[PDB]
A paper describes a structure:
Phosphoglycerate mutases (PGMs) catalyse the interconversion of 2- and 3-phosphoglycerate (2-PG; 3-PG) in the glycolytic and gluconeogenic pathways. The enzymes have no amino-acid sequence similarity and differ in their mechanism of catalysis. iPGM is comprised of ∼510 amino acids and facilitates the intramolecular transfer of the phosphoryl group on the monophosphoglycerates through a phosphoserine intermediate and is the sole PGM in nematode. The iPGMs are monomeric bi-domain enzymes where a phosphatase domain, structurally related to the alkaline phosphatase family of binuclear metalloenzymes, is connected by two hinge peptides to a phosphotransferase domain8. The glycolytic phosphoglycerate mutase, iPGM is an attractive target for the development of broad spectrum antiparasitic and antibacterial agents owing to its essential metabolic function and evolutionary divergence from the human enzyme.
In a subsequent crystallization effort, using an 18 amino-acid N-terminal truncated form of C. elegans iPGM, we prepared a pre-formed Ce-2 complex purified by sizing chromatography, as well as a mixture with Ce-2d. The two subunits of the asymmetric unit are nearly identical with an RMSD of 0.20 Å between Cα atoms for 520 residues aligned. A relatively small region of the total Ce-2d peptide surface makes direct contact to iPGM (127.1 Å2) with the remaining area (305 Å2) exposed to solvent as it is positioned within an open pocket between the phosphatase and transferase domains. The electron density for the cyclic peptide was prominent for all of the residues except for the terminal tyrosine side chain which was somewhat disordered, while the C-terminal 4 residues form a short α-helix. Notably, the Ce-2d C-terminal amide of the Tyr11 residue is 6.5 and 8.4 Å from the Mn2+and Zn2+ ions, respectively.
Numbering used by the authors:
A (entry chain A): 20 to 549
B (entry chain C): 1 to 11
The structure:
Amino acid sequence: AMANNSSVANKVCLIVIDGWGVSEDPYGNAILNAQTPVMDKLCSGNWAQIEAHGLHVGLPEGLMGNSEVGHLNIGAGRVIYQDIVRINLAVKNNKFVTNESLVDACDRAKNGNGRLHLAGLVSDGGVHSHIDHMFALVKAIKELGVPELYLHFYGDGRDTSPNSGVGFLEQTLEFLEKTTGYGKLATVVGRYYAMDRDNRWERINVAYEAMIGGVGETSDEAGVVEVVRKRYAADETDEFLKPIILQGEKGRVQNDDTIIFFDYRADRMREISAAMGMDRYKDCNSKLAHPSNLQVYGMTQYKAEFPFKSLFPPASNKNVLAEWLAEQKVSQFHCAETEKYAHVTFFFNGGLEKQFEGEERCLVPSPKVATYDLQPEMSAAGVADKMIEQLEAGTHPFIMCNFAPPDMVGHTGVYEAAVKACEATDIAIGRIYEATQKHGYSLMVTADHGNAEKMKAPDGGKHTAHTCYRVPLTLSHPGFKFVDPADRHPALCDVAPTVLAIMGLPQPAEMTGVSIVQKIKLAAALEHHH
Amino acid sequence: XDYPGDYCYLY
Ligand SMILES: [Cl-]
Ligand SMILES: [Mg+2]
Ligand SMILES: [Mn+2]
Ligand SMILES: [Zn+2]
C-alpha cells in the first residue's frame, strides 16, 4: 500500500494478453475458432481496436509487433522511437545540424586542432548503420564549419552482397568530391577486422593500426576502386578487405583528434570504440603509440560504462506508468508467468531493471515441458489465481498481468494447441472479470501484438510469427466511451493515459499518448452543444 | 536489450 491509494476514482485491473490480435479472417484464426465467450462479450459494444506494430509503436513501417516493444509502449504512454526510425526522422527534418552531441564534437574540433573523423559500416544494409546517415553527418559537419574531416569506411558484405562495397565506395567518393566538395576518405577495411564482437583483438588491431598508423595498402581516390576490384578478383570480398590507406599521415587518427562512430547497433562497435576511447588499445598489443587526448562519440550508446557522448542517447522514459503511480503514492501489482516475467517488469517499466516504490511483483512458474503445445494452457490459471487474490484483498488500485499462452503456443505453429491456448486464456479472463465486478475494479483487456489469430499461411503451412493486426482494448466501466485520437489511429501508447484517466489521476507531460476514453456526461455535453 | 529503442527491439 501507499499513502494516496484512496485518491483514485476507480481501481483498474489491466490484462495484457500476449499474442492476441483482431482479425476477421477465420482461416487458421485460433482466437475466432476457439471457444472465447468472455472476450466475445468484452470485445463488443464499447471497445476499441488499437495498433501494435510498425510506426504506431516506433518500429519501421510494416514491421510486426513483439512482446518487448509492446510492453514497453503499453507501460510508457508514449511512442518509443526505435533507433532506425528516430535517426531517419532526424535526417528527414535536417536535425543533425542542431544535434547537441554533434555540435559538441564539431566545437571540440573547431576549438582544437580542427580534425574530426567519421567511422562506421558503409552500406545500405541498415542492420548496423546506413550510408544515408553518414552522408547526412558529412553535410552537417560541413555546415558547422569543421576544418578537416576524414572517413574510415568499414566494408560490409554481410548485410549486403559480398561485392557491393565497390558501389558504396564509388557513391562515397563522388559524394565527397562532387556533392559536398568536403571530406576525405582515409581508410577502407572489412568489418571482419573493424567490427569483431568476440574479443578477437588481433582482428581489431588490423583496423586499429590502419586508422592510427596507416598500416595497409597505400592508394588514393583515383586508384582505390581498382584496388577493391583486384581484391574481389582474388576472392577477398567486402567483409574481409584488408586495409587500404588514403591521405597518408594526415588521415590517421592523431593526438587530440575527435572521432564519431556512426553505427547505431552497439554490439560490433564496442571493441573498436573502446580501443580508441578507453584502455582496450592495450589489448590490441600494437607497437604503435596510441594517440593522446582523443574524444570518441557514438551514434548511440555503446555501453553505459563508456564516457562517450551519443548523438541519439537513450530515450529518458521518465514517468512511465509504473514510475508515475509511485510518484503519485499509488501502489501497484505486476504478475506474469516465467516466460513473460521480464515483459511485465523490465520492459513494462521502461526497458531497464527498476522496481518502483509500492510496486509488488508476482512470478508464476511456467510448466516444465519440452514445448508449450504439450501444455497449451501453460500457467494462465495460476496467474488468474494470483490476480483474483489481489482483487479480493483490494490492496492495490492498479493491478496488471500478462497471459502467455496465445503468443507462446502460437510460436509452435500447432493450430489445435493454439485453439486450446486461447480457450484457457479466455477462461482465465472470465474468472478475473467476475472478481473485478465483485470487488469493485474496472477491467481493461488489451494485447501487446497479435500472433494466434493467424496460425496458417495461405498455402496451408504453419505460421509461427507475430502479426501486424490490431489488438483489443476493452473497458468494463459503463461511465466511459472510447474515442479515437484526432490525427492517427489509437495505439499502445494510448493505454497508460487511458488507465490514468479512468483512475482519476494526472497525466505526466512525458506521456505524449492520449486518453482514448471520454466520460459519458462530457460526451453528452459535447453532443448537445457542438 | 541495453536501452529502450536499441536493435533488439526490432524482434
Ligand atoms: Cl521519453
Ligand atoms: Mg472465439
Ligand atoms: Mn512472441
Ligand atoms: Zn508478446
